[model samples]
Target chain A: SLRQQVEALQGQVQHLQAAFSQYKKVELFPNGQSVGEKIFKTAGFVKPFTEAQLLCTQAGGQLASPRSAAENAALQQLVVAKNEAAFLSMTDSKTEGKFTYPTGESLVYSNWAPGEPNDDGGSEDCVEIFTNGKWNDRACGEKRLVVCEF
Target chain B: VASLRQQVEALQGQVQHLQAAFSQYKKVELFPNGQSVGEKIFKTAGFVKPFTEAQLLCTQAGGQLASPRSAAENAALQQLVVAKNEAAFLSMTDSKTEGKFTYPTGESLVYSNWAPGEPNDDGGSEDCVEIFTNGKWNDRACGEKRLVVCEF
Candidate 1:
């Protein structure tokens, strides 16, 4: 009967409501630096591209990659404050000239500094943001500040 | 954060799907997890539909077509309806037998407030009943639209 069906629907609602509250309690600690849907955080340490990726993953976020000019500016705040470059989520390590997101999706937007990503010396693949908000493809072995996005 | 993002989105979709399904069964009444003295509580979603659709709405909301068992309950139900400033459907109908009214349970009315000349079977198609905000019961066409008053 309809009564039985409605009661059945509510069983999910009741349980989901509980789980939903639990999700809220899981806590997201954004270091009070956020832009619209983008949240940025850092432990003020420097790590190589590989180590920086691990740092963000362990912190419940991803290596910060600026998808737009506004995002680039937002991320530059941390870099400019610390006066150090930061590793981004974009890398072309797998195939030269094919910059991709952490998911390996080819980049749609980029902020390469003039003549940068030249694969200079045939080893530059990891991307980093300068204090002025421009991007430069540098050696993956270089250590840069850890910035994460949630 | 990413895990929580996926969970929040999934939860959001779950509720919206449930809400859309529930909207299909939009019978009006006030059964929002409350009670009153063993008497059924009544509420409305401000629905105004044919008598048949009204019943579907009520039952879907885990309630029954609205009816009052006593003077107090009648007054109480009417109070909820008063907010609509319009007439609302009652549970009684004579569709099963002309001029032979009965509740959803098929029981005869033990209490009534029919205005004089009501159940006149006007146009010979008046089978449902409605209660005006002023408290007058009038036999009306079952196909006509009226506010639903579901009781829980």
Candidate 2:
């Protein structure tokens, strides 16, 4: 079902990407990055959230932040394949109960794992994605797979 | 049946285009190069390619160009690429600081296995390092071809 759904959409999306691509001068594709619309990239470098963020920023992207299921699924498959979890680009740093992106904006959506944002250690300001594609609040210091979205 | 399948397609497309209107960001996959070695997995693209091409292969696969951090790790990698009998490209390069070779991470090596008096920066142009079948390391020209070994 997911396969057909994937293929079915792929047939059209490729049409759209093609149309959208032709609509403008397109860039290029990467076998060297993450799959999806080709926006995010997961570097297998395991590092702390801040360090990972630094790499992404220096490399011309930010740590990935998926706004919906399609984007999340795109990242999840690769993160799971890497056999590691990756950090998402949202945090509750400014306020314990509210989450926001690094750009000082609120999250458009969230898929926190059950009972998450519980702020486990009184300071799980950063968020991470597990193998199942669910989000968990984690300390920014904990090492995680670096995933950046350009 | 055709109408229904097409119908299913339209429904999803409606939702798809809703967000895709903002599809300025086209994405790509870093292919999963999952080659496991004694508890450590690396990507060994079974092809004889250039040092630059090797870097692109591993980086596109969400891994880095293989840089051995340990003797055991280097040994495993050498064996992994030994079948090809061609030396492989390593991520370490001295392009930035002439004599200071470092990873793309820009960190100087914690471990190294340079060949006997090697890395003479031969011809005053060698910048990339290649690993021989014997697992010995040496500085080579960056543009040269070598076996590709990627660390996952």
Candidate 3:
């Protein structure tokens, strides 16, 4: 049966995908001190490099040489603080992947892009979530036109 | 003179408390990757790519990444180093954790140096630990003596 093969291959494909989807190790430098204290802030992607350099400058430290004990310790503190702060701020954003959407549905099934939103009838990924008065796809990987929050 | 002595003793006590706090900080976390700044900073440096990977690897290793900010950051890192040293020394004092000899783990070939049958696998096991050089590691007997690595 076509359905049976689809289910079987789907299972295999999912298994492989999980195995292959490398759990990337990301060492994020607290290059953004201002953002933490709410004193300095910027959009995520715009001028990414400049933003990074600014963070480096504020740390009054440039990622150490021999990455000494002192240097690493400072970095750890900053990371712990920022991550804690971000997690708190995005409390609404983090729940089972909820995001803010404006119109009850931000440009909903306006159009399905082939085999899209394949939510497994469990947690549908395509719907735009409303929080803090804005809309965005629950699936972060899905790129939608943006209206910047200032 | 008596008053001066009292003041000096107070200062010493403060230092001792700080030392303990610093050691605690390091013990709370584990190092995920190791590197020196010389090899890491530049666009063309050999350490750049791997350093980046090492930082990421550390995060993947279930530890928070280092984010130095200001001179204070250095102070924090120093505390961790001191703590590690304290732990190592304490381990040496314990007859159970110290081994007389052992061979480096197979994963050690990734970097440099070993003293020959180096990781003698004393007590039938070899574990990774930091050497003073900052960028290197050594495999030592679980029960042998060791000096703590830290700077005041």
Indicate which candidate wins on lDDT: 2
Cα lDDT computed for each candidate against the true fold: 0.75, 0.76, 0.30
Residue B92 local lDDT, model 3: 14
- Give the lowest summed-lDDT range of ten residues in model 3 chain B: B39-48
Q: Candidate 3 DockQ category? A: incorrect
For model 1, the local distance difference test gives: 0.75
lDDT of 1 by residue, B1-152 (tens): 46655655576577778666553433221243112324355665455789987887566445567787777777777776787777889989998999999998899998888888886999998999999897778999989999877776
* Model 1 per-residue lDDT tens digits across residues A53-103: 998898888999778877888888778756788999998888899999989
Best of the two (1, 2) by TM-score: 2
Candidate 1 collision pairs:
B27-B57, B29-B43, B29-B44, B30-B42, B30-B43
For TM-score, the strongest prediction is 2
Off by over 4 Å in 2: A1-38, B1-152
Q: Could you give candidate 2's per-residue lDDT for residues A1-150 as a string of tens digits?
A: 656785876687667755454322212122123345557767766899889989989998899889888888877876765668999888888888899998989988888898987888697889999989999999999999888887
How are the candidates ranked when ordered by lDDT, highest leading? Answer: 2, 1, 3
